[PDB]
């Protein structure tokens, strides 16, 4: 029975760093602050672990104590599928409080404690494609701080600086609101034309702009990067609709990838394929609620000869794309040249995802997820 | 570099069967008689096995040598995507030799090998969903042998053994060439019929006709079968026709189940989803290539909400089916009136799949596939 889980334990914690969120959502530098971190950690009876970090609401103690525990407690670990499925079966009920967010970090810890208690690394466990795999440098939504993401120009500076550091692709984020005039589809264009011709014809290039514009807009947004050259159109619209992407999709040369946000997990990315709402899939750990439900994606995908491009950095996304082929890229991000990216997390002793000077992230062979957690940063800089 | 693979092997053994094939490949009881078998086993620096079996033609020298040792040697045993993959590139190219049987063999030794060095069941690894599961007995296709399976009452008294042992569905392979009448849309119905009546309302019943029937004669089977309440009709049109598959499931009320034989693996698996070809998908580890694409293929059907029914018996189907949700039956079988499943193979300690009197079959808490081989035996029965 030593493989049977005897806890399930959050640790709320404080991690410095320079990311803000704006009233929407979007991430932008700012002062350096505290916020609050939470590790979600599952124990079995021989005492072997495993850690994921999420957000302290996704993992508060009404969620961990009607739904988590109940379900993990007293169960064989390895059994991720019945235990995620028990997990689903439960959302419906949940009054909205269990949503994928903690399906997924509950996934992703149970992931990380088969992988330690085994030594191995969790994409060798599922089963490895490759070791190593070119990321793109995901810029974060544009701002209006000077020399910051707040002119086109200011997208053509750092896409230089992204080149030099090794990066093969980039992806612009463009901007969206509360920025004050945001959104303008003619400055979304101006800011992927300038970055095409601060890289060049070869360095490949994605857009990710405001995720609501009208279908005009998006239209007008897409047929603007049909000129650039560049390789996927990704969000621009309300990823409710569905049948909004369908029709982009078949109005634009340049492909569409998606759904990011929409929910539905791998059964409603089904859909987009089914109705062909987009010509790349996307899916990702936070997406579709965990590590185990991101693989089906990505299979799902590869049987119809799509590729499905994995959303989000970290390792539990390294992991998905290490283990699987129809995927061009590891997502790193998100960049600013305000900050250093290598700097990585105080809680983390090295980074999950070190890339070389060619442009190339190099999966840690450290057992489960890898992350090299700091525990006694984490003790030392408890809130509850 | 414990992990890497230093040698693949290929033992064949005689088998003491009364299990003989026709001259269009399907199995019926005979004289007892010594059968080639062959074991595939693959070995790592640190001594560590795996291995699995098939018939020799799909692992000889020209497969293994060409192929086969050409990918693995040398490389982590962990990367059986990688490892899959390659192989599966270099089909197109090999002159019809390297089959998905071939694939099939060496994913799952690879999969045996992790399981074992790890001291893991195989779906305990992939993620268990369940420990046990519902098996089905699947009838041996129809002879002309007395008391066999010659007459639809022979059909009929058979399934009233089959319920008594446990069995809470049954499937009939009915009448095929090179039996001299057949094949017959009436007997095969009145087998049908009989066994209906024999079992009653509430054991599930399932057939597989006939794998080559006209349209007209697969219409006229389906429509006999609703009135018979039957779960499912198998097979009962050449599959390489995907769109007589769409009309006959638009056609028929009863569900249609496949495609069993089609080759394209999960690729062509997609296609028979997106043109509606069948009601529940159907794969299986010798019909997709392996452990893996069957986990895909799985994958696939759950995100369109379907069932995928798991085609075969002995361990690497039984894993499949305790790591997934989607699928309703363990295959369990061939089974004929003159044979005793339950005894089992003379080169396997004990059943893999040994069933209850419930009906359910328990996975083997062993690692890897967990067939308890007996490798004095195949030692003492060595052929080459
Ligand atoms: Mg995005
Ligand atoms: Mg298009
Ligand atoms: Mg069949
Ligand atoms: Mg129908
Ligand atoms: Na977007
Ligand atoms: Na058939």
Same mark, same amino acid.
């Given at each position: ?80 599928? $019945? #235990?995620?499925? %028990?997990?689903? =079966? !439960?959302?419906?009920?949940?009054? +909205?409080?269990?949503?994928? @967010?903690? &399906? ?99 360095? $490949? #290039?994605?857009? %990710?702009?405001? =995720? !609501?514009?009208?279908?005009?807009? +998006?239209?007008?947004?897409? @047929?603007? &990067? ?159």
């Amino acid at each position: 029975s030593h493989m049977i889980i005897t806890d399930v334990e959050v640790r709320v914690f404080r991690t410095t760093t320079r990311r803000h969120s704006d009233s929407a959502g979007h991430a932008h530098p700012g002062p350096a602050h505290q916020v609050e971190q939470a590790m979600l950690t599952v124990r079995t009876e021989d005492g072997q672990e495993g850690h994921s970090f999420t957000a302290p609401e996704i993992v508060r103690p009404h969620v961990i104590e009607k739904f988590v525990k109940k379900v993990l407690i007293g169960e064989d670990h390895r059994d991720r599928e $019945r #235990l995620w499925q %028990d997990l689903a =079966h !439960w959302q419906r009920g949940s009054a +909205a409080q269990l949503t994928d @967010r903690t &399906l997924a970090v509950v996934d992703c810890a149970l992931w990380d404690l088969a992988g330690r208690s085994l030594g191995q690394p969790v994409y060798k466990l599922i089963g490895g494609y490759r070791d190593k795999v070119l990321a793109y440098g995901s810029i974060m939504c544009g701002d209006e701080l000077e020399g910051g993401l707040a002119t086109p120009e200011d997208y053509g500076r750092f896409a230089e600086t992204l080149v030099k550091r090794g990066y093969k692709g980039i992806k612009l984020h463009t901007w969206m609101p509360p920025v004050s005039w945001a959104p303008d589809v003619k400055m979304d264009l101006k800011a992927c034309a300038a970055v095409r011709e601060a890289v060049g014809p070869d360095i $490949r #290039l994605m857009i %990710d702009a405001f =995720h !609501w514009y009208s279908r005009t807009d +998006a239209l007008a947004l897409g @047929r603007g &990067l049909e000129k650039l050259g560049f390789d996927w159109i990704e969000e621009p619209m309300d990823e409710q609709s569905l049948s909004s992407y369908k029709w982009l999709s078949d109005n634009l040369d340049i492909p569409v990838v998606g759904p990011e946000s929409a929910a539905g997990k791998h059964w409603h990315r089904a859909e987009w394929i089914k109705a062909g709402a987009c010509d790349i899939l996307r899916t990702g750990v936070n997406d579709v609620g965990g590590i185990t439900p991101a693989l089906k994606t990505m299979h799902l995908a590869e049987a119809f000869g799509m590729e499905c491009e994995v959303h989000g950095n970290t390792a539990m996304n390294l992991h998905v794309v290490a283990a699987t082929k129809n995927c061009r890229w590891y997502e790193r991000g998100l960049l600013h040249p305000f900050l250093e990216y290598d700097d990585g997390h105080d809680y983390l002793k090295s980074l999950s995802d070190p890339m070389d000077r060619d442009g190339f992230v190099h999966v840690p062979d450290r057992p489960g997820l890898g992350e090299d957690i700091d525990f006694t940063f984490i003790d030392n800089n408890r809130v509850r």
